[PDB]
């Protein structure tokens, strides 16, 4: 169910991404709320597109983890932690990660264009 | 910065596509303006999707350049010209190009479907 995995581990919660994805979209004040909700949804979809993740819910990238953002083990993050705790721990680093993801995709797009240009 | 490449060459400006892409989305009269802005954004995303470019900012296609649209050299277009000048020079040919891109993607989708049908 919607948000039922919120208290579950990140691993267990990663298997229910479509439930929340479906639920995100599902006078003047209500029109403003609906237009803003659409704009937010589209901003998140645009941001995924910029990263090359436009059609994926689980999207792997070419940006390495710095370890300064979090030096936890994979078992500590995926088995012993929830998504709310993880989001809180790295709330100060999401703009750095987003910037790196955008730069990495821009480099990937240029590399793909150049590879396609080889006769 | 947003539109900072407007006076730069097409090549130099092609490296800043995410700045404008991010900035495009970022009572009654304002709701109409916001709904129309969303509809325009979605029309451009739908048009890219029709061409098979739904997740790309730089999307290569299978439509050849006719040379009647513009007989300029690549250095004349990418090194000695801006995007505003280029857009003005081919403003009378964008519907032909869009039609060819749509037809080419429709053919590609049928070919992919038939290739996937080979056991």
């Amino acid at each position, epitope marked *: 169910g919607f948000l039922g995995a919120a208290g579950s581990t990140m691993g267990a919660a990663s298997m229910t991404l479509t439930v929340q994805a479906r639920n995100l979209l599902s006078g003047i004040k209500q029109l403003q709320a609906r237009v803003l909700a659409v704009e937010h949804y589209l901003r998140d979809q645009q941001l995924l597109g910029i990263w090359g993740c436009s059609g994926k819910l689980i999207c792997c990238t070419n940006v390495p983890w710095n370890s300064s953002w979090s030096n936890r083990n994979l078992s500590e993050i995926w088995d012993n932690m929830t998504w709310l705790q993880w989001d809180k721990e790295i709330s100060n680093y999401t703009q750095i990660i987003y910037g790196l993801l955008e730069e990495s995709q821009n480099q990937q797009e240029k590399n793909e264009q150049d*590879l396609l*240009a080889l006769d | 910065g947003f539109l900072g490449a407007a006076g730069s060459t097409m090549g130099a400006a092609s490296m800043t596509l995410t700045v404008q892409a991010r900035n495009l989305l970022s009572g009654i009269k304002q709701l109409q303006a916001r709904v129309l802005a969303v509809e325009h954004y979605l029309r451009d995303q739908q048009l890219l999707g029709i061409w098979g470019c739904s997740g790309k900012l730089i999307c290569c296609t299978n439509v050849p350049w006719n040379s009647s649209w513009s007989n300029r050299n690549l*250095s004349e277009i990418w090194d000695n010209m801006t995007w505003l000048q280029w857009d003005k020079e081919i403003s009378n040919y964008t519907q032909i190009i869009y039609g060819l891109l749509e037809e080419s993607q429709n053919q590609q989708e049928k070919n992919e479907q038939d290739l996937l049908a080979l056991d």
Partner: antibody
Amino acid sequence: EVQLVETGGGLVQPGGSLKLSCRASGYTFSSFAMSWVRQAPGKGLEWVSLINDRGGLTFYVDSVKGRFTISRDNSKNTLSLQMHSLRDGDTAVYYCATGGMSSALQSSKYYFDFWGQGALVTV
Amino acid sequence: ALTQPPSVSGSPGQSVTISCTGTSSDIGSYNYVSWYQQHPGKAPKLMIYDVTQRPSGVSDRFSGSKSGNTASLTISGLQADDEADYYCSAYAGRQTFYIFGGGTRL
């Protein structure tokens, strides 16, 4: 004019490692793709490796894919090559070449525009 | 590799033909067969790029052509200063970028 000047090692025992560094001037380094081309003392020339103008893409001959790494620093106007496991068949003069590729928005190359003088790598 | 005769010669002032034959995946399908002139002890210089085009600084005595899977270089007005080893280089796709021929001594 355009000049490419090789710096490198000499005799290295079989199975070791050697790195070449090629300086270039007279043109914008970051605007051209670079290649390394090898010529054995008694043979003609063969292509060894190709790097893009930005350095993101590298290509190698199958026989050297696991031994040679090509890299470029566009701020230092320097093209370097590093090779490991130097086999007896790899002794040759290694020439820097400008050209061999272009990044889609430029006219086609698929040829080498400029050549250096060549470093001699022996075993 | 591409195959060309190991030796070419002629009287000064006369034309000579140098040619190399490859396969359909090397010379035939791609119109990118360049030619280089290498003097002993010197690095090769670019003489011809593309099938028929010449770089700036090279005289018009050097002219390229292609037919079928065979590429040729015609050198008219042969000079004593042209006695150099000539090589052809063909683009052969994405897996095999360049294939060079053996040299011919003029």
